[PDB]
Amino acid sequence: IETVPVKLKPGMDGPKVKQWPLTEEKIKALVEICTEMEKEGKISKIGPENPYNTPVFAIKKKDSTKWRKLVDFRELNKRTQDFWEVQLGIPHPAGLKKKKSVTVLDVGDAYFSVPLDEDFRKYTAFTIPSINNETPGIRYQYNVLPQGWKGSPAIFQSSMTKILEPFKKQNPDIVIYQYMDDLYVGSDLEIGQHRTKIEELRQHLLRWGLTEPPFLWMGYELHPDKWTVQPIVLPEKDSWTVNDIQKLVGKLNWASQIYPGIKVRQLSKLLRGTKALTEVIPLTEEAELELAENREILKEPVHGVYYDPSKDLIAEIQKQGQGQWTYQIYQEPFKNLKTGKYARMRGAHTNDVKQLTEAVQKITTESIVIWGKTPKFKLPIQKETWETWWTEYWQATWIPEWEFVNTPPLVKLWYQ
Amino acid sequence: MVPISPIETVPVKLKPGMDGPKVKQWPLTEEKIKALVEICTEMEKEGKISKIGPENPYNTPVFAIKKKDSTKWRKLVDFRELNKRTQDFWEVQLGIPHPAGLKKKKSVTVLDVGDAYFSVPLDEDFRKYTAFTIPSINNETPGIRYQYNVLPQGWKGSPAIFQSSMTKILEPFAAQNPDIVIYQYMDDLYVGSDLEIGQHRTKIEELRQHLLRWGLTTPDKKHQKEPPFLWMGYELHPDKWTVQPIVLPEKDSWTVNDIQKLVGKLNWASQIYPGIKVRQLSKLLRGTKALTEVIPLTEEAELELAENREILKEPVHGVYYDPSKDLIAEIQKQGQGQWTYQIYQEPFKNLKTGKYARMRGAHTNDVKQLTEAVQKITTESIVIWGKTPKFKLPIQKETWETWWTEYWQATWIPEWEFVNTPPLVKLWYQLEKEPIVGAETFYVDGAANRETKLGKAGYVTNKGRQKVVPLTNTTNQKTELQAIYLALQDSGLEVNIVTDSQYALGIIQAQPDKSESELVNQIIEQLIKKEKVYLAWVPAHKGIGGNEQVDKLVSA
Ligand SMILES: CN(CC(=O)N1CCCc2ccccc21)Cc1nc(=O)c2ccccc2[nH]1
Ligand SMILES: CN(CC(=O)N1CCCc2ccccc21)Cc1nc(=O)c2ccccc2[nH]1
């Protein structure tokens, strides 16, 4: 009820970020949403004396019929003080990713009950644009902790810890993690009763709220114990063409950067001569040995692979065709913290961008669970194409950082 | 006395760490001083300014300027220093509406808010920063000191505060009269509606009445202007719009100045006149900074210019936007990385037009450019109409499907239909996914000496066919492409090519149909003639046979 003092990092001003164009329907939704928020005291109209701006848009959450307001606080979040005051930080729970089932709740509405520091409110300024600039953009700022702001969970953490307090006591085995507006609840329990337990949690937030949140009943069911990774695998053939062998040697040469003892020589020696690509080459016993030794090597994990919290997580994505995507997560090249693959994008087929966008969201979710933060993406898409379409497919309350890959990587084949 | 509501004051601050301006007052002529004193005296009576004590340390220079052929004076305050020290404001005036997004209105009235401007008070604590001094006659008395009580003309914050104040006043009136629309531009208000002129004039009077509650005045006797309106470089008529007339000069010689007015005129006209091309005229500015220089006009640009004037031969108009109808966009390929488009609702009536130009780069293809142009048009349409148009594109459905399924990058274009107006965008070649049975296999390599720039390129094949060619003034990358070129040159309609070049493969995997590299363009021309091409990559120096052999052959 009394504000916690909040400031920007030294030497940097508040965000000034251009609002990007919005469709008519997203504009109407925001006008409708912001009008109510204004009546609830959550936001207030602002004057020209506030130069600051942060982009806003509207989305529809998974399995929902109604618009939600999403603010992109990425610029503000970079510029806001790290709140290390009470705690350096939570050590990220390692047990969350080892849980059979993890459920993701939107608790974000809980933030709206806590007022925002008066001096800091101007930095939350955002603009509802008008079609064809026919009317002035409608300018608001936040009076309370905004969703998507890095300071919101940090500040509200006090209240949150007391609310969950009775809960961890009778359920000490449950791992609970908070990231932004999301609450991640893991357990090793069977699903049916796990689901009901989740329902129990929702009731806690209700009773405290009235002393009704638009998004709270939803949940996102995950199974991190069941997430599959991708060791390097080599073909097993009775018949090897010259082409087959060239690709193998190519794949082994690439893996050799990652794995120390990979040998291509006895395999390379089969390539002796100038031969038709489709000609079948019998494997020599030297070659079969070398191929077999390489398999053993590839079965072991990479050596000297560790996570450094002081460094960025980098996620790379390859489009493999037929709705299949591959990705790797690493801080350092050739040391992968995680690799994975996705064939399942839901009703997304004819749209590559929609598939990519969903892929990015899943990879970020997994990254939030494992390390407690978001990776920086390298996207196999032209900037202008991505920047045009991604807001149309975006279902998450947070947003990661991304860069674009303009040169097709050779390595896409090796993850194929 | 009828009590009037005060206009809410906007709090203003100087930039952090900065103080107000202190600037010397210029000496003025005796005749000038008399003028300024007269002006300031009435301005003081009106409440616009106030005399101040000696304690205000701040000063801003004041000038008097002579309007031509005449006796009469205008007062000018130079706020350049105060503006440097004034905080940033939100500028709502960024985007202007585009006529193509405006709606037909049966009636439109224009109101002059000039007098309403000075009823907008300036923040009390900020007034001291506006202090200025009228020099005394012969400097024999202390100069007269004034400060502003209202938004000074020429100050950084005046326009944004003014418009934001006006907007806040207008809000309830607009909200309770949804059947009219109001837009504010500078000193004017544009109030349109579809009401009959009688009911419309009523609502205007109601509006004049509403502004009166804040004491605000709109001129009674109608301004003498009637459609067309000249606004922001446009002509606005009740049923149609276009740009203000574009006249392309006749000139014996063209400088860089000549062409820049010309590119501006052309770019400006391109939003309405279909098929304008600026590339060649823009081409003459490449890496050339001398402004007075006269550049000889290529014949290729002459044809372009003549093509333009023929399009400019007669006036063309756009219509306004009808929300009840669909928005259509059609694209044409003009050649040389140029693209042109029309956006329309009904056939042969354009809302607007435009062009798109290829981004600078080493290699490209028409499908990527078409895709880019679609994104641009998509974005421009969201801005203007708040929605994505349906596209009419000169590319076959099957072509697009083949392209995006095999392209390494994720790509998408929104709802679109094929229109058959040549030239059609197509795929010129597609490489095979698997090696070709029965096709000859060419192992290629190239190498160069970094010092002597001497190199070699060639191939050896499974049929014992071989070539190696000596090269001068070349590089490793160049020799690697030449090798591939030779294999294409010397093979049949179906061929398998093996290379160790990561450079070459990176180029080919980008599927360029045209390049800045003459060598890449020759390779493309060869690819087009092939029935089937399979390109395989191997790592170099791994003792890969026939690759090893040709590597040795080219490194000698
Ligand atoms: C024909 N057309 C435009 C027009 O006459 N003017 C009149 C003056 C120039 C101008 C500048 C911006 C917007 C409209 C106009 C009618 C019209 N159409 C509109 O959609 C509109 C929306 C808000 C306010 C006035 C408006 N007027
Ligand atoms: C050329 N490349 C793929 C490719 O870029 N394709 C092949 C698939 C379709 C296509 C269409 C237009 C342009 C290029 C392409 C085939 C290939 N075949 C290989 O055996 C190979 C072995 C090692 C490393 C890379 C390789 N690449």
Q: What is the DSSP annotation of B34-55?
A: HHHHHHHHHHHHHTSEEE--TT
Chain A, 198-237: which have a CB under 8 Å from a chain B CB?
none
Q: Which residue ranges does chain A devote to CATH 3.30.70.270?
A: 95-119+161-221, 222-307, 308-416
User: Alpha helix (H) ranges present in B107-239?
Assistant: 114-117, 158-175, 197-212
B93-117+159-227 against B429-556: fold identical: no
For atom 1 of ligand 1, the residue with the nearest CA is B238
Helix (H) or strand (E) holding A352: helix A352-371
For atom 21 of ligand 2, the residue with the nearest CA is B536
Terminal alpha carbon distance of chain B: 104
The rounded distance, in Å, linking the Cα atoms of B350 and B341 is: 10
- In eight-state DSSP terms, residue B137 is G
Chain B, 400-459: which have a CB under 8 Å from a chain A CB?
404-406, 408-412, 434-437, 440-441, 443
Strand-pairing partners, residue B335, are B338
Ligand 2 midpoint to CA B533 (Å) = 10
In contact, B162 and B151? CB cutoff 8 Å? yes
The rounded distance, in Å, linking the Cα atoms of A338 and A328 is: 6
Distances (CA, A) of B481 to B477, B495, B500, B517, B519: 7, 16, 11, 10, 7
Ligand (nearest to CA of B508): 2
In contact, A301 and A336? CB cutoff 8 Å? no
| Nearest ligand 1 atom to alpha carbon B103 | 20
Structure tokens at A313: 């997580």
Contacts of A50 in chain B (CB under 8 A): 90
CATH dotted code for B1-92+118-158? 3.10.10.10
State whether residue B265 is helix, strand or coil. helix
Fold of A95-119+161-221: Alpha-Beta Plaits (3.30.70)
Contacts of B379 in chain A (CB under 8 A): 21, 388
Hey, are the CB atoms on B545 and A412 less than 8 Å from each other?
Answer: no
Q: Does the beta carbon of A413 lie inside 6 Å of ligand 2?
A: yes
Ligand (nearest to CA of A133): 1
The rounded distance, in Å, linking the Cα atoms of B280 and B303 is: 10
Resolution, given in Å to one decimal, reads 2.5
Backbone angles phi, psi at B109, to 5 degrees: -115, 145
| Nearest ligand 1 atom to alpha carbon B182 | 24
Chain A, 298-317: which have a CB under 8 Å from a chain B CB?
none
Q: Does the beta carbon of B502 lie inside 6 Å of ligand 2?
A: no
Structure tokens at B224: 């003498």
Fold of B322-428: Alpha-Beta Plaits (3.30.70)
The rounded distance, in Å, linking the Cα atoms of A396 and A218 is: 13
Structure tokens at B307: 């093509």
When the candidates are 3.40.50.11720, 3.40.640.10, 3.30.70.270, 3.40.50.2000, the CATH number that belongs to A308-416 is: 3.30.70.270
Chain A, 239-268: which have a CB under 8 Å from a chain B CB?
241-243, 246-247, 249-250, 253, 264-265, 268
**How do beta strands B229-231 and B188-193 pair?**
unpaired
Strands of B416-418's sheet in order across:
B350-357, B338-344, B328-335, B390-393, B416-418
Backbone angles phi, psi at B235, to 5 degrees: -115, 125
DSSP calls for B350-375:
EEEEEEEEPPP-SEE-HHHHHHHHHH
User: Does A182 show up as a binding residue in the annotation?
Assistant: yes
Comparing alpha-carbon positions, the chain B residue that sits nearest to A383 is B372
Helix (H) or strand (E) holding B80: helix B80-84
Which amino acid, B161?
I
Hey, are the CB atoms on A380 and B376 less than 8 Å from each other?
Answer: no
The rounded distance, in Å, linking the Cα atoms of B83 and A293 is: 74
The rounded distance, in Å, linking the Cα atoms of A275 and A292 is: 25
Nearest one of B365, B364, B316, B373 to B341, comparing CA atoms? B373
Contacts of B371 in chain A (CB under 8 A): 382, 385
- Is domain B228-321 in CATH 3.30.70.1450, yes or no? no
User: Does B551 show up as a binding residue in the annotation?
Assistant: yes
Structure tokens at B109: 């009235």
- In eight-state DSSP terms, residue B298 is P
Backbone angles phi, psi at A262, to 5 degrees: -65, 125
- In eight-state DSSP terms, residue B197 is H
State whether residue A177 is helix, strand or coil. strand
Nearest to A21 among B160, B379, B510 (CB): B379
Ligand (nearest to CA of B193): 1
Fold of B93-117+159-227: Alpha-Beta Plaits (3.30.70)
Q: Does the beta carbon of B536 lie inside 6 Å of ligand 2?
A: yes
State whether residue B146 is helix, strand or coil. strand
Q: Does A383 touch chain B (CB under 8 A)?
A: no
Experimental method: X-ray
Please state the domain extents for chain B: 1-92+118-158, 93-117+159-227, 228-321, 322-428, 429-556
At the top level of CATH, the class of A222-307 is alpha beta
Q: How many residues does chain A have?
A: 416
The rounded distance, in Å, linking the Cα atoms of A61 and B528 is: 47
Give the closest-approach CA distance of A108 to chain B in angstroms: 29
Which amino acid, A146?
P
Q: Which residue ranges does chain A devote to CATH 3.10.10.10?
A: 5-94+120-160
- Is domain B429-556 in CATH 3.30.420.10, yes or no? yes
Query: Peptide bond preceding A375: is omega within 30 degrees of 0, i.e. cis?
Result: no
Hey, are the CB atoms on A271 and B534 less than 8 Å from each other?
Answer: no
- In eight-state DSSP terms, residue A264 is -
Strand-pairing partners, residue B216, are none
Angle, vertex CA B94, rays to CA B90 and CA B100, nearest 5: 145
Q: Count of A–B CB contacts within 8 Å?
A: 185
Q: Does A159 touch chain B (CB under 8 A)?
A: no
Helix (H) or strand (E) holding A354: helix A352-371
At the top level of CATH, the class of A5-94+120-160 is alpha beta
Which amino acid, A52?
Y
